[PDB]
């Protein structure tokens, strides 16, 4: 049972008629289908042609603007181009692929039209009403190529459009749902529209099959537009292509990995608080490997003795960790007070505050960014 809103261009075709329909959809959805588009056939022919014609230029290179041709695993090739209106920007890699150019111009007029509708639909500011126009925009044309498993990603633009509603999965709002509508184009909204909706609209990540020769066009206002759009694009491209990111943005990449490590230890701390309190209800402090399975269950991942010791790095007085007579690590809450607990009554706030400054210390430093919290060394 299709649960994706479908906009039929045969019925409603005009902007005054379309605008309320779009707005009604965007209040509950981030994804919708487009039925009976005029150039759907031309579009499907061009996509068909790509199987034998106009192959990805493998000698083109893939630069720091995340454009060009990029060989991926399992004989899949990525081709990508980014265009921006702003003369101050240097995205000069021109698309020489005649099929992709033809596909682009059809997806462009279409995408731009519905992009303006989306902004007028759920964004209040009048300054942002004209941000995207025929004279102000940024596009990302992406092509996957298969010689003959899913990639999750969260688009960051206003609107991203697929010329073929196939081999794509979405989350309806708990589990991914496949989309197979060969006569439809697929539309999905990005994080920019949601943020600018100030609550009205929310979006969600997509899954695509990289082996299914998927093409897509994403629309932005000019990348220099302040909400730092470029920062979100960069972070998204880095998440998508970590190997390229290692080459051109190794610091940005390492910082991103560190952020996950911070999220890890913070959640680990609160989970440790819960587990230790429940156990303390019964003299002798509990051994750590006894508590680990329960800790792992709440963390929904494998947690070893080394992970617990990461907390002591962030805050050495958080727990009393010692070796018992049986040479096992015992852990318990501190009995006595220090300067910290005499002036800050919250243990969680104490930790999270000291975790943020530790993180800030690492990224401020003039040293190679470590991507994890080192484990604290306990003496014997």
Residue numbers in the entry: 12 to 159, 186 to 210, 217 to 270, 277 to 331, 335 to 432
Copy the relevant paper text:
The process of eukaryotic DNA replication begins during G1 phase with the loading of the minichromosome maintenance (MCM) heterohexamer comprising Mcm2–7 subunits into head-to-head double hexamers with double-stranded DNA passing through the length of a long central channel. This topological loading requires the Origin Recognition Complex (ORC), Cdc6 and Cdt1 proteins. In budding yeast, Cdt1 forms a stable complex with MCM before loading. We propose that Cdt1 stabilizes a conformation of the MCM ring in which the Mcm2–5 gate is held open to allow duplex DNA passage required for helicase loading. To understand Cdt1–MCM at an atomic level, we determined crystal structures of two non-overlapping fragments of S. cerevisiae Cdt1 spanning amino acid residues 1–438 and 495–604.
The structure of Cdt1(1–438) was refined using two independent crystal forms to resolutions of 2.7 and 2.1 Å. The fragment comprises a pair of well-defined domains corresponding to the N domain (residues 14–298) and the M domain (residues 299–430). The relative orientation between the domains is preserved in all four crystallographically independent copies of the protein chain observed in the crystal structures, indicating a rigid linkage between the domains. Perusal of the Dali structure comparison server revealed a striking similarity between the Cdt1 N domain and Fe(II)/α-ketoglutarate-dependent dioxygenase superfamily of enzymes, such as AlkB and other DNA/RNA dealkylators, and the Jumonji C histone demethylase21. However, the key His and Asp residues involved in chelation of the Fe(II) ion co-factor in the active sites of these enzymes are not conserved in the Cdt1 N domain. Moreover, an α-helical hairpin (α6/α7), which extends the dioxygenase fold, occludes the degenerate active site of the N domain. These observations indicate that the dioxygenase structural fold was repurposed for a non-catalytic function. By docking the crystal structure of NM Cdt1 into the Cdt1 density, an MCM interaction can be modelled, whereby the middle domain of Mcm2 is sandwiched between the A-domain and AAA+ domain of Mcm2 and extends to contact the A-domain of Mcm6, following the outer perimeter of the MCM N-terminal domain. Conversely, the N domain of Cdt1 projects away from the MCM ring and does not appear to be involved in any contact with the helicase motor. The N domain of the yeast protein plays an important role in MCM loading, but makes little or no contact with MCM in our structure.
